[PDB]
Write a protein that binds this ligand. Structure first.
Ligand SMILES: CC(C)[C@H](CO)Nc1ncnc2[nH]ccc12
Ligand SMILES: [Cl-]
Length: 166
C-alpha cells in the first residue's frame, strides 16, 4: 500500500509521527478512523481537525446521522463518508477518562477496527480524551488483528511510544 515512512511495531501495527489529517490528505486511505464522541460533535482534537479539513461536511453528515439513529455507544462506531480525506470514516468512541468512563471499554472500541482490512487511525481515548497513550497503544496491539497505521501528531509522545514499546 501507499503508506510511507511508518515504523513497524508488530506483524500488523505500524506508527508514524504525523497529523492524521495530513496523512489522510496524502494517502486517501480506504478508511480513516475518527476519535469520535457519542454525539458526533467534532469540536477539537482529532475530530475537530478532521472535520475542519472537510470544510464542516463531516459535521453536517454527522448531524443527520444522529437525527436518524441517535447517539453511539461508548465503545461503538459507525461508518460514514470520508469526504475529501478517505473513502470512509470509521467514527469510533473510546471512553473519556476525564468524564469517568470505563477504561475497559477501550478494548471494545478497538475491536471495531477488525471489521476493516486496513485503517489509518489515531490512538483512541488518548489526547483530549484523557487516557494514557502508552496504554492505548498496548490495547491496540493486543486487540486489532487487521493492518493499522497509527499517526501520532506530538513528536515527544511519538518518541516515548516507540522507545517504551518492546
Ligand atoms: C490522540 C493523541 C494521542 C495524538 C497526540 O498527538 N493526537 C493526534 N494524533 C494525530 N493526529 C492528530 N490530529 C489532531 C490531533 C492528533
Ligand atoms: Cl487529541
Amino acid at each position: 500500500n501507499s503508506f510511507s515512512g511508518y515504523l513497524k511495531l508488530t506483524d500488523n501495527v505500524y506508527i508514524k509521527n504525523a497529523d492524521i489529517v495530513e496523512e489522510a490528505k496524502k494517502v486517501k486511505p480506504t478508511v480513516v478512523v475518527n476519535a469520535a464522541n457519542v454525539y458526533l460533535k467534532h469540536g477539537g482534537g482529532v475530530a475537530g481537525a478532521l472535520n475542519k479539513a472537510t470544510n464542516n461536511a463531516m459535521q453536517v453528515e454527522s448531524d443527520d446521522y444522529i437525527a436518524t439513529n441517535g447517539p453511539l455507544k461508548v465503545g461503538g462506531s459507525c461508518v460514514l463518508s470520508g469526504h475529501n480525506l478517505a473513502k470512509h470514516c470509521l467514527h469510533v468512541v473510546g471512553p473519556n477518562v476525564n468524564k469517568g468512563e470505563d477504561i475497559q471499554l477501550l478494548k471494545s472500541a478497538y475491536e471495531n477496527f477488525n471489521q476493516h482490512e486496513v485503517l489509518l487511525a489515531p490512538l483512541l481515548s488518548a489526547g483530549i480524551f484523557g487516557a494514557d497513550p502508552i496504554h492505548s497503544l498496548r490495547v491496540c496491539v493486543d486487540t486489532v488483528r487487521t493492518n493499522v497505521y497509527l499517526a501520532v501528531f506530538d513528536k515527544n509522545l511519538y518518541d516515548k511510544l516507540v522507545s517504551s514499546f518492546l
